[PDB]
Amino acid sequence: EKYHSLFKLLETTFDDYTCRPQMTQVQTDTLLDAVRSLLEMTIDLTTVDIMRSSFARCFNSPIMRYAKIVLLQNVADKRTTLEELLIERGEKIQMLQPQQYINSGTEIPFCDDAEFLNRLLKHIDPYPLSRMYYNAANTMFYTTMENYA
Amino acid sequence: MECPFQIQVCISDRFFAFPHNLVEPQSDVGNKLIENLIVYVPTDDDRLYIDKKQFPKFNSVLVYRHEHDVNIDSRSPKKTASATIVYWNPLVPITEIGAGETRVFSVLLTNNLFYCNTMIVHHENPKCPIEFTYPNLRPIACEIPLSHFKELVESNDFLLCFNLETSTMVKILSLKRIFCIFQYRKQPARYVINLPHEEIDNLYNKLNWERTRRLMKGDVPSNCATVNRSSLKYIKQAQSLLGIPDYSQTVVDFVKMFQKIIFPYQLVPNVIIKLNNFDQMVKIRLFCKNDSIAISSSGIVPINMPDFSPPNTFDYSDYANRTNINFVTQRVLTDGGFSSGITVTPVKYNYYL
Amino acid sequence: MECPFQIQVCISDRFFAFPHNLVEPQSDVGNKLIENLIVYVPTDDDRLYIDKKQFPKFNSVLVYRHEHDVNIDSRSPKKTASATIVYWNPLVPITEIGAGETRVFSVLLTNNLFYCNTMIVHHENPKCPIEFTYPNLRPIACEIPLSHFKELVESNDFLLCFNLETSTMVKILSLKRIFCIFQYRKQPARYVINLPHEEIDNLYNKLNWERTRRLMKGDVPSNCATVNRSSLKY
Amino acid sequence: VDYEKESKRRKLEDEDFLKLKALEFSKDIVNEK
Amino acid sequence: RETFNVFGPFKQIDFMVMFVIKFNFLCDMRNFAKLIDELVPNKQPNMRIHSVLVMRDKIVKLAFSNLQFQNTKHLQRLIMLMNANYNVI
Amino acid sequence: IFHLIYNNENAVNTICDNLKYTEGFTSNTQRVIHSVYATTKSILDTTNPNTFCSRVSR
Amino acid sequence: LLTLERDHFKYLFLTSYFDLKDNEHVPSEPMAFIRNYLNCTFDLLDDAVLMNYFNYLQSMQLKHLVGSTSTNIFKFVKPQFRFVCDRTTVDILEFDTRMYIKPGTPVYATNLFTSNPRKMMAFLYAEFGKVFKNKIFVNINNYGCVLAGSAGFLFDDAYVDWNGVRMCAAPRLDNNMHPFRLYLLGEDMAKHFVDNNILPPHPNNSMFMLKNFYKGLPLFKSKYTVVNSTKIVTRKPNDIFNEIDKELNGNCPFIKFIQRDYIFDAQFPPDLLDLLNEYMTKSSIMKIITKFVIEENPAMSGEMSREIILDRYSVDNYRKLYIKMEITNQFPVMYDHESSYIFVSKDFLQLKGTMNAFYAPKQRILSILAVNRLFGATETIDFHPNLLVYRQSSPPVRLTGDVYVVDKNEKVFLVKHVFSNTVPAYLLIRGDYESSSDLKSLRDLNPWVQNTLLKLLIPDS
């Protein structure tokens, strides 16, 4: 019962699915609350749309002997190039003013406690660099994907 | 746990020193008084504090260290009609009984004596000592307080020490006797227990349970309580935040500081709330004379009513709803220019608004 | 805003100078008059204008600067049966009361005293001063009008000045006292307030609200009004 | 009217009870042995 | 205090030093009072002079507070004058 | 350190006051002195209680 | 024998349940009947009427009401109210050191009242000895005898909690005339008295008396000059808050919000509620509620000789009253310096776990009322360090008046501040600040603000 709204959203994907669902503010808030409670996080209607598009693609896809590897797309009409985004975003940024700044020179605050460094090293030894690298790289890649989409 | 009715237990703080006067010969079935007396003590050293000359009623007096006789079930201890048996501060089950009634005097009230039928509790006017946790102190061999008795009744700054192999029950008895001595001190005495914090906490818990047993047996309430280490740490943090020197402010007075708020604002001080929570981990409610309502951690409650009003007393649906909560939270986020750390909760209400 | 009935407030332009004659010992529950008098003033300098010798009815007289005691709710101020309490031109809530009825004399009528139950309003025949906004003027330290009292009652061209850190309520009280002095002047006096226009407008608004409060308490209408800066420009 | 004479007497005793215990744990005049 | 002690280890030497200072002070105060006796005092003090007096008294009190230290009729009259209790008679 | 180990409070106080009125005490010398004193006092507070318990130990 | 109608059962309850003296308004029939009932001239009364009244009490569902169909309930010392003692004792507090009671011990309030417990002790302890006998060591004082903190008897006032502890001074002093009620500990004592129809030897009387089902609240007639009145029903606190807000905004300088301290005792018949509406209990709850922002000009001033009272006379029914401001009007007794309540506006939110702390987002300000309570908050916000946004300033922002250091490392300070409408409080700020005058120790602050600060600052690990 808690997730009926999300069920309805996804079920609507069974149709043409190339459409923007229309919801009241109350409906959108209910859906976001349901999703956030499910995943326990934060979230956004952008994530809602991402899930809608992904599930629509999955539902429309046929049964296949192999998994289908795709890229995020169809999220939030006009196709924009990286160059146009560069121009517009740079103009807006230049319009923006520096919230805060430091003075020239300064000095990087390196730590000194070698015992502290050794303690941290011990604390991090059981962490597999392979897993950490994989996680970090995929985090960055997925965030970039979301921004592009 | 069961006890034989033949044992009669008297509990009194005075019993930190042996009550020679109270000893009396017991009579047999033939109503013949027994001139032999056997005194049982928890440790061998205790013998030195038993004066045999203080027993004119008896002709022979012997003293021994009571020891758990694994071969005798305390549910039915062996009887020795040849002597009158007295136990002083017993720490292990009594496996032997004397003619007539076997007498017991104790400053402690452990489970062993708790179920004892005949329980005589002496009442005293409370007089509390001062906990002075701090790294000119006078060391005290807790195992033998009576040796330090003069210092204990004169000085006011004691470092309580224990032998490495001292037993837990011995420690408990020593602490109880010392606290009784302080109960008779006119001037409260500061003390520091040279033991690990967890051990001290366990000892305090056991002492609290002993006091509870005494109350259940009819002892008079005493405000001379003790504070768990976590509670002491919290009090120290509060004092430091307020800029109160720890050595200057005592915990009791620190807490009493908020009695001015308790009634007039009809609110429970947060310090008392936290102390109660610590004790629970090891709810609050109160009122004033002639008061019609009770102040509680939950708020105002009609006297004698449960800590919570009937569930349907108040309807919160108007604002206690996702729509209103989200609206208010979003408004707060926008107005304050925030992005995290914001949390809004509907306000529930007890019996009264 | 609530007030305790134990306070009685008298409003009179005359109170620009302290009414020594009107002070009288208060009686306790036992009907024993209190020979100790405590006079409260808005600023320390005010003390110099309280003559202790003008209180024969009392045996001991002390004067202090009334200050907001954040630790006392004005809804129920602490009582001091040991002394008779009088407040002169109070600017902050009264947190203390004396034996019997705590007396108050004020040329101003702020909200604090507005809800006060016992309100005695002295009526005067109006006599207006002259606003003379213009860049031979006689400077007047408004914070201490009684010092300039002689000039205020003699000359007719005054430059009203204030110390930089003077408080808003102090300014309002000073202006009210000066205007009372002019109300008793036979000859209207020209004056110039050496303050920013917006500040002067706010002060005039507050004075108008005070006069409104006095009217609602039964004061007699007075044509001696003031003009906002925009109206003056027009 | 059965007053708490027991409690009153108990407090009176407790007043000097510590002194009595001090007497018990005092010094002895001579060593008979 | 040492210069005065030159004349002896007097019991109340600190009080004596304070008294001598205040007495030398009172001499010139009597001089001023004589100079001004003919003139008419006002009901209230001159405000500017009063402010100056308060401000200087601040410093004087600070100094003499920072420096902590250690036959009755005329004695007490003069002492009351020294302590500025003008209720002296 | 010696006037601390040996219970010479007079000498400790003399040194403390002299350091208060010697050199740039406030800048960093004060903190250094307090650190040294705190370390010595911590060691002494660790030792002395156990020492007293040993003294009275049976 | 005298009789009484169910329509007069309301008068009977009014007279017998509360400590009421304004009895002149009792009609003649209930007046005489209740007079005999109270003076215990039961021989002149119809016992069937007593049974009907007991059934009426049961029907209204009086809390703790325990009894049977025996006239001995009224004619003899009998347990009339039952409830379990359960005290979460806080030993660190110097409570009223009364005789200890084991948690879970049943406790019974009997109709018996005495002017001297010590004298009754003889007879009551005789009964106790009858019940137990043997040589059971017991805790006995001049005010009762207790067995193992689980059985026995004692004397106290007519109204005790038995779940909380006793602390602080008494807002009410009725002991001047109030005799001690008898309380019985243990099903044994309760059953013994019920079965034996125990009754102390007669010298009602000066020495003692019976007050059947007598709660003894300080009830009195309002005697109000009602300019106007209206009633409402709701269980939604926002509705009451809206009413209060409307009244304050219109012209009300301050409202007297009263809640009756017994509305949870029974399903009172509407007729009984109407009868009670004429009366009030000195111990009921009151709040002097004003508005945070006070309009400067007098254009908003209302009538100067009238007051607005909002009485929660029942669980769900409230009555708004406009009355003439008159000294003779009687009101529940509050604390001598009872702090006033301030209504909460939409500009800020009350901090969770605080009765006097709120936060204004648009201003980014945390404020703590010096001596005043908050009121009306339907919402609260959890404290969080982000609220204390660090103020940036190249030169330290100067501050005046009283300033206190909360965290020197975090540049957290408490600044005394009075709202222009003269509302004392303190502002908690974090940022690059400096003080014109000497910073002051927090100990100077009152316990109220200090408790609030402890709650707000010490993390609840």
Numbering used by the authors:
A (entry chain C): 156 to 196, 200 to 234, 238 to 310
B (entry chain L): 1 to 135, 162 to 308, 320 to 390
C (entry chain L): 1 to 135, 162 to 260
D (entry chain I): 462 to 494
E (entry chain I): 594 to 663, 673 to 691
F (entry chain H): 117 to 174
G (entry chain F): 7 to 209, 218 to 475
Provide passages from the article that reported this PDB entry.
The BV nucleocapsid structure consists of three parts, a central helical sheath containing the viral genome, an apical cap and a basal structure attached to both extremities of the helical sheath.
The outer rings of the basal structure and the apical cap follow a C14 symmetry and connect the cap complexes with the helical portion of the nucleocapsid, functioning as an anchor. We term this structure the ‘anchor’ complex. A major difference between the anchor-2 complexes in the apical and basal structures is the presence of Ac98 in the basal anchor-2, which interacts exclusively with Ac144 from the lowermost Ac101/Ac144 module. Nevertheless, this interaction with Ac98 has very little consequence on the structure of Ac144 or on the rest of the anchor-2. For both the apical and basal ends, the nucleocapsid’s elongated tubular section, composed of helically organized VP39 dimers, terminates with Ac109 binding. Additionally, the VP39 lattice transitions from a straight to a curved shape due to interaction with proteins forming the anchor-1 and −2 rings. The main influencing factor for the curvature is the presence of three Ac104 copies per asymmetric unit, each interacting with a distinct VP39 monomer.
